[PDB]
């Protein structure tokens, strides 16, 4: 049951009332994930999914929220019999975690589109019997909290979610699906994925949430988008206020992606007296370096995108070179295709467009241009070096000739006299290459006219030219 003290702020009549509820829950022993997710899902439904009749804020009456809460706790209590799964030592068993995951799974609609917006919350689970992948993982954690299983917590990589549990919180279990058309591993550890050094499991440097970070996850999971062209200003404001609440309490310290989300929101609508977006992007990077062995990709991607939106070519290139410096120490594995797609888009779409405009601006007499800065050429080379190194040792290749066309184009945007200024130094501006592909490219990088067939051959598996 909801406790009397959790009920005193209702009805929630505004954004600020929702913030007060979050503040009150975060001041408790254990914030109530089920309560909080139902409230966010309710207000998201009436602010983004169906705004018919909206005049200011969708008032959340206790009767409505308590009935939804009852629908959730009744299903879980009815379907999970704890007596069948004795808690040896005040911690949960793998079989109990599997049973909770099965209860959530089996409740879902038989067929639906899993990539849809607004299917992340317990409100969606109860009212639509629909959840997205990470929403299932969150729902398992919320169900386990409702059952009294204090040791079950959300684990997060940059592209997946699962749970940790058991003695010392040591154990991992898959509870949801990943992607589309991958091998289901529900009930299993994540140790094989850690051991193969895939991006999906971050070499083990994934997030282990406490209950406060699970609150942060649901706040990051708010989706303000009404349609392809329109975001809810109300939900943007709510998400931003809740993220500042979490920030002030210390609960974003170990949550790089939340810091990037908050930076993006500040760029859209700055809050007076708060840190600038750039400061926040750098805090996200610092969080990843401090708590996650600098093994995360997205802190640098967030930064690079900010610089790319502000047409700061130099700083954008630097940040994408830093993204590649992280990926180089991974193996490219079968379920890592999201980060492959991201690197492909940066190399083969975003950087080309940025350099195309820089070339037009140089023609018009720009000063201090990235295209005249050898340190920016060095960043471009370091980006490709990290992608080539990533590929080394990987079970699946990364580069192909479709990348080569864009590499040659991008190289050519820098004049030979600029390119010549970078010194590529061996172990045992200056740049050291880690990848064997780039080390073999070195001479080709300073010619007045780039040799395109030679570059293609060096970047790719191809080793012959056409016969005729």
Residue numbers in the entry: 2 to 53, 74 to 386, 399 to 459, 537 to 538, 549 to 588
Report text from the authors:
pmcMenin, a 67 kDa protein encoded by the MEN1 (Multiple Endocrine Neoplasia 1) gene, is a chromatin adaptor protein that interacts with MLL1 (Mixed Lineage Leukemia 1, also known as KMT2A) to regulate the expression of multiple genes, including HOXA cluster genes. Menin has been identified as an essential oncogenic co-factor of MLL1 fusion proteins found in acute leukemia patients. MBM1 binds to the central cavity of menin, utilizing Phe9, Pro10, and Pro13 as energetic hotspots, which occupy well-defined hydrophobic pockets, and positively charged arginine residues (Arg8 and Arg12) that are involved in electrostatic interactions with the negatively charged binding site on menin. Importantly, recent clinical studies found emerging resistance to Revumenib treatment and patient relapse as a result of somatic mutations in MEN1, leading to point mutations of T349M, M327I/V, and G331R/D. Understanding how these mutations affect menin structure as well as the interaction with MLL1 and current menin inhibitors will be crucial in the development of a new generation of inhibitors maintaining their activity against menin mutants.
We found that point mutations in menin do not change the protein structure and only minimally perturb menin residues surrounding the MBM1 binding site. On the contrary, mutations of G331 to arginine or aspartate perturb the charge in the MLL1 binding site on menin, resulting in decreased MBM1 binding affinity. First, we tested competition with MLL1160 and found very similar IC50 values for wild-type menin and the three mutants M327I, T349M, and G331R, ranging between 4.1 and 8 nM. However, activity against menin mutants is significantly reduced, from 5-fold for G331R to over 100-fold for M327I.
